[PDB]
Amino acid sequence: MSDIHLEDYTEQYETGFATVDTMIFEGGRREELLNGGWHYAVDQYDTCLRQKWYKERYRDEKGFTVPIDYSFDEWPVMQLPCSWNTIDPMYLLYEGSMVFTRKFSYIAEREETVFLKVGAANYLCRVFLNGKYVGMHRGGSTPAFWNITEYLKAENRIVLAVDGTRRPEQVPTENTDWFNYCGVYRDIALIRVPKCHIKTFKIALVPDGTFGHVMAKVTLSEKITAKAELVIEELGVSRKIQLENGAGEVVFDAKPELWTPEKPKLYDVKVTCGTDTVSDRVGFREIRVNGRDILLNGEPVFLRGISCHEDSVENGKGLTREERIENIRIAKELGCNFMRLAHYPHNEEMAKLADELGLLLWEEIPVYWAIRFEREKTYEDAQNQLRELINRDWNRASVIIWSVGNENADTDERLKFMSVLAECAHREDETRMVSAACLVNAAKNKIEDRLMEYLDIIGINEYCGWYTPDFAMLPALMENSQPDKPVIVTEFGADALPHHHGTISDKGTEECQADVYEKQIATLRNIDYIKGMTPWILYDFRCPRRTSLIQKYYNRKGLLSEDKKYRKPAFYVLQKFYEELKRKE
Amino acid sequence: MSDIHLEDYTEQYETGFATVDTMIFEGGRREELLNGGWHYAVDQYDTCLRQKWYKERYRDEKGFTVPIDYSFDEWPVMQLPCSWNTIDPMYLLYEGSMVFTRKFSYIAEREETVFLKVGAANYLCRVFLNGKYVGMHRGGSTPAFWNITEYLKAENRIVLAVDGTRRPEQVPTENTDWFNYCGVYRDIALIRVPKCHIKTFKIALVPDGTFGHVMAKVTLSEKITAKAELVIEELGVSRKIQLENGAGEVVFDAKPELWTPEKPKLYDVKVTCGTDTVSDRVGFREIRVNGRDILLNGEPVFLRGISCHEDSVENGKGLTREERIENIRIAKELGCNFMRLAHYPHNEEMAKLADELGLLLWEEIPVYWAIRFEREKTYEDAQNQLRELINRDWNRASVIIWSVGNENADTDERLKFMSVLAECAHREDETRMVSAACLVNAAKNKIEDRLMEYLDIIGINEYCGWYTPDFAMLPALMENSQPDKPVIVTEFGADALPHHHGTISDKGTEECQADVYEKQIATLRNIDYIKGMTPWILYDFRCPRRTSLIQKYYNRKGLLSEDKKYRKPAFYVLQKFYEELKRKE
Amino acid sequence: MSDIHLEDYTEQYETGFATVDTMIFEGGRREELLNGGWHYAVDQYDTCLRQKWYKERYRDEKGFTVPIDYSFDEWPVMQLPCSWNTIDPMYLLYEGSMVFTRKFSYIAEREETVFLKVGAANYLCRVFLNGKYVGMHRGGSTPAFWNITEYLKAENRIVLAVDGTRRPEQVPTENTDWFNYCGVYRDIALIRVPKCHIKTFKIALVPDGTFGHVMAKVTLSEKITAKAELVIEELGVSRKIQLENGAGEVVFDAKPELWTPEKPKLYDVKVTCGTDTVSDRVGFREIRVNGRDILLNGEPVFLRGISCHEDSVENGKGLTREERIENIRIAKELGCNFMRLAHYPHNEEMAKLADELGLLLWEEIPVYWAIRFEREKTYEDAQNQLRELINRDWNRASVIIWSVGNENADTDERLKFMSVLAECAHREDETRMVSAACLVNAAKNKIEDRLMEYLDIIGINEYCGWYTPDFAMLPALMENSQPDKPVIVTEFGADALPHHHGTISDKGTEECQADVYEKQIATLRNIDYIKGMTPWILYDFRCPRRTSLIQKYYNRKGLLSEDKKYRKPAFYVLQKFYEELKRKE
Ligand code: NI
Numbered sequence A, B, C: 001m002s003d004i005h006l007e008d009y010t011e012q013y014e015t016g017f018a019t020v021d022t023m024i025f026e027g028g029r030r031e032e033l034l035n036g037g038w039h040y041a042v043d044q045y046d047t048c049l050r051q052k053w054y055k056e057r058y059r060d061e062k063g064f065t066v067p068i069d070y071s072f073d074e075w076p077v078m079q080l081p082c083s084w085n086t087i088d089p090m091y092l093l094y095e096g097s098m099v100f101t102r103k104f105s106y107i108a109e110r111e112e113t114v115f116l117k118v119g120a121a122n123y124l125c126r127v128f129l130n131g132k133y134v135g136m137h138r139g140g141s142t143p144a145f146w147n148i149t150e151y152l153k154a155e156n157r158i159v160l161a162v163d164g165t166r167r168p169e170q171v172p173t174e175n176t177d178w179f180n181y182c183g184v185y186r187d188i189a190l191i192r193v194p195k196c197h198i199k200t201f202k203i204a205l206v207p208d209g210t211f212g213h214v215m216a217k218v219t220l221s222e223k224i225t226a227k228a229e230l231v232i233e234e235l236g237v238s239r240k241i242q243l244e245n246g247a248g249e250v251v252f253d254a255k256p257e258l259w260t261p262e263k264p265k266l267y268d269v270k271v272t273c274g275t276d277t278v279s280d281r282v283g284f285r286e287i288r289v290n291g292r293d294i295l296l297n298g299e300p301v302f303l304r305g306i307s308c309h310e311d312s313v314e315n316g317k318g319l320t321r322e323e324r325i326e327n328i329r330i331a332k333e334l335g336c337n338f339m340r341l342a343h344y345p346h347n348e349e350m351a352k353l354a355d356e357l358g359l360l361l362w363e364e365i366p367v368y369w370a371i372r373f374e375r376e377k378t379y380e381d382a383q384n385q386l387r388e389l390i391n392r393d394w395n396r397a398s399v400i401i402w403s404v405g406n407e408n409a410d411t412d413e414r415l416k417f418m419s420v421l422a423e424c425a426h427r428e429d430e431t432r433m434v435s436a437a438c439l440v441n442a443a444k445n446k447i448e449d450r451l452m453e454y455l456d457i458i459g460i461n462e463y464c465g466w467y468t469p470d471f472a473m474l475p476a477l478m479e480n481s482q483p484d485k486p487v488i489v490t491e492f493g494a495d496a497l498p499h500h501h502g503t504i505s506d507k508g509t510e511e512c513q514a515d516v517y518e519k520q521i522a523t524l525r526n527i528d529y530i531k532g533m534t535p536w537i538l539y540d541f542r543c544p545r546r547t548s549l550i551q552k553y554y555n556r557k558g559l560l561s562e563d564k565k566y567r568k569p570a571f572y573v574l575q576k577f578y579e580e581l582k583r584k585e
């Protein structure tokens, strides 16, 4: 009677992990999706994992039918991918488990390996194929890959069990300032590849100040002596890459036009190896820090930014391509050259669109507030998510900063945890800057945090005029501080319910929010070491912490309403500043 | 930064407990309810307990307003008491926290102590009054009492934070076979009493075989020497009780008509002590076991029973008086003299109506499936709920059996935990029988479980013809067993979706369910040691484990549909059996 | 290309008919229903019958999948039995085909024959089992039986294709004055019987004027020599019946209390033959005609009647038991001893409830208006429906009159068709009277119709004061006529929209309807040869011919509104008349 008497029914599924080490490079690969209607059940008590519905035991050993608690083909249907919270109002506040199943046929036209990719599933995803357990993924915003070659038949049943439960030891914890959207909400794909295939492919301008050297790195699925053929036709590049034990790299001379948000030049690149082919569309640029300067392609820059969550009234966390394009267009209308994508990895199409339309990006993992920094398995979770993100987005010129977390306490255990993450980012990616968003040192009203020593760029969150209501605290904060690194003010802002007006002293009104922006900008614009800002936030987003009548379960710090149809007065305050900077160059 | 960086934000509230030791006797006490509209928020991340909204800190020390995430008087309103899951479809699957608040005025007309009673709140209830923490209750089906005398002002604000979260270490665990209804779902009351008041009052027929002696026990809120006076005018009784250190008892002669379900005679009793008065309405009966016989008032009985959950389509767990009367009336129409109230304490009005209308009762605590038997604090939770139940219902003649749990594994840790619970019940109540529902010993197909040694009556659950599909296992089971004490078959049955028909071999149909009842009765009715049965169950109830098309998130073992408007064929099978037994006397 | 180029795709299904000759007697037989949720499609073009979906050809001979236009297990679900028109507003006016399918398991515990019964399906029902065609039924209001023994497997799929299409050559034609309710709307059953089983059982009081002799006739499924034994324990009866070639009968002495509506005495009767047993619950009464007198148990009666359709706002033609009880109770409150069930066989439970509650009945087949009297296959359809009705209801004491049709033209072809139907009824049932509802002879304003010669009782429809607006035509009609047999006025009345008032000259108002009843009763009550009346009608019913603002697609001649919650003034006019007759005895 283990289905009712087994206390630790999940331990048996802690195997077959999808991790950064099972990802494959997808550029240029044809994929068949499993998007569509899946039969589903709400599984509030995790009954599928206790009773093992995926085994489909309908009769006992003696031929008697047994009672069952599921009916796969007669279950209702839900269109995947989606955040299930926005499918039906009954599911808005549901954060337990749902079980999804469908069938598909499989015929190999040649010898091939097949991966299942789940583009994102929050928070846990357990995979079953033809009655057998494939494995699981932990972490709610990164793609998960499993080699399913050995499970496939001519006709298949796949089951996905997805648990939205919040837990203090997860990354993030159970307490955040955003909405817990659950389910399988980015594309589900089948990827056929040769037995010997390209597993990783990384390419970048070498950040040596000459703008004339390009590095490319390849690893294969097998330890083999081989070569790859790299082609960049527009740059006249055709170079051999020699592979030893399935890995190799090359550095070669080239003269690309350097990518900027204003001139987002991209190049088609193609790599062959054995019978395999991949391709990408990549820009070349150098991002460095020199003293207090942020240098893009050798030139100091001011990052005119805005923060942005992955939220949608209709789609929850599963934004469409159109919604991503809208966010970039509105940010550029606002005058931005930079966007802070908070607080987790967004859909990879965001950085691809930023590559194409021209917008610098900061990408982040949800090491947020009271992470269990002492727990080794929590470190393993965080480091895997960091490395998944870096591996997924390595070739995105638009991305210039990896952030290892946000608003964590300055304790010994936090410093060990997050400094090692910062070292991990640097080791995984020699081309990009590493940052994090820190709280103000309240005792000294000072930019001072032990983590900052390990960062290329300091992010500081401050809410003077709001959570720190006395505006005079802001000039004092900047006078008290003299960092030797560039500073991005990674958050400031104020709530305003759309169309809620009052005096500038009425916190929560449009007038007060615009007044906060006026005072913030008047101080920050003349601090020499502040080299950017990403005010919180582009538009209102669902938020379980905000319950007042002038919040209505949305964080109201957006410069636009939650459907992005309406611009609040503070939008035009920030825009006027950014357009001034643009006019000055 | 405590509200965002404190990991263990709940430890500070582990104080001011409501327990069996803070209960007061309520019979004959005037109460003022706080039922009504309460302003409320969905508090998914427990923000109220982290930010301490109940302190209502609206300005800082320098007079600046600070942003806040709540608005008590402008929140929407929910009528309490209720299960919040049936209030709106958005809350059906919500099992986090909600925060409720309202105001009330208080004027003492004489010196008095005041208790707050929360009739039931699942699972945790934290109480705040005028910005101060009063305390909390743990356990989802028993009434909670706090002395609030020292918190009261002329105008008051009360805040209740109620957490529906399921946890493995709770009682029950996170895995049950019933629906997790959450909220404050029985009466909220203010109770004014003298400073020295009657704290407990227990009265029962002495089970000495004469039916002519009555015991009465009183304790006071103060450890003093005093006399109480007990009056039963209809029986010519007036007796003093000498109290010492706040406690005393007396045994006296009386000639009551003995309570039975067929003739449920009740008597008004009144007790005074100092300036305090309490009263009750009680029946007098003797319940004993002799060998394999269950004896009511000296005569062997067969308990023609049905099991029953506290479930309602419209009201969730917060059944109305009319719904309880309906359940009793339908049970009696079915031919029952007995009902198993599963698996937790029902509203105390159930046993009061059973006293009045005439139905014998089994009441139970949710020590169900995989309880953390090794954890001392889990034992403390279970023991407290057991003692709350017994103290609440001590004077209910209809209740004859306390059950200490259901379908637990026969392990050493379980045995230590549940045998000590059974000893607790025996020590707390010398007048009633103790039982539990046990699984069949699958190794021997036998009624054999180490806990049975500690019980007066053996409860056995068996599902031959259903989960044990071979009917032949049932005669084998009864042949293999020769218990020395009475056996109640506390569960058997089969799913049937209302109006879903098929052949008797189609599991899940009405015809198969009726066939299972026919074969169960044919065997059970001729087993000498089976003195009762409570088939599972009177009517269909919400059940998160049952997801098939012929279940629809209801357990379908009811003899009636979930609205009790429709009787399935198996209803008449059982009814015919019970009416034969009644015909025979 | 058969599914697209075959013009006559239905001819292949004109086989395996369910007819009166395949019916079996059901009294006392255990049945397993197939009522429940069936997966279904709207099949507007009869694609299932052209493409043969029931063969489930999913792959071609080379193993390729082929496209299909159905998905049995993933279709939506409809609860059967029902009139599909009242299931959803989208189906109210749908009268094409629908396809229903489900599965069921079958295990024979002994050698047995199995019948499928479809209690009623309007108009055509085609049956498929495990991919094979079983057969079909024609006729929308009678039960259909097919021997499916040789089709059954351990796991079965049944498909029912049901066509509601109206056709001029059907019985009824495409033009009626009632609503075309479609679908399988009475119980679907599986019936297990011995190979040699009792096929028909008929029992009645011998109409020889002694009231002391009972006849009983039995036929078997096999043409063998055997004895049956008949028992009526309450009357001290036990008699053998000698069967030869599968058939025999017996007449025996018995002293039953004679059934009347006021004292509806019934008796349990049981018949055994070999291993088979059937039983029934029957009353004993004599119905005869002598001159102009209708004699019940030897006494002249006046039939205080009302007409009644099988109509329900919520359920369409699939009335519940409660709705039938309501119709009988309201008729008796109106003062009726008699009801005309128009214009087709109602659920057989109607006459069983009339047996029990006490109401005399007229039952009728829908040979209505412009039947294709010249077409032999239309005659075959009508004769079969008549014989199905008579075989179904032979043992119902409440039924005293079989009606062979309604308001047909007095032509030579009609006379040949309907007189042979009347001879059929007489030959099939020696115990009951035969009638029909005839139009007034408009040339003579006279009761005169060539079919009346073949009837025991004359039914005349007349609408003086309504369709014949001059009331003076009614006394003229009765003056012009001097029939030699009893006359029942089988229809009169007037529209009244509930709560629609006006002057007595406003046709369509309550006042005018009451005025018509006053004048009808004033004349009819003093005509010597009028021995009964069944005014049209008890309550408003759906009617596609009535489109005015004061009709709203209902026939408004009811004495009550369509939900039977409201009694119009004419209700009390008729009630006052019937209670005067009852007062007089
Ligand atoms: Ni406005």
Ligand code: NI
Residues within 6 Å of the ligand: B499, C035
């Ligand atoms: Ni039914």
Ligand code: NI
Residues within 6 Å of the ligand: C499
């Ligand atoms: Ni009126």
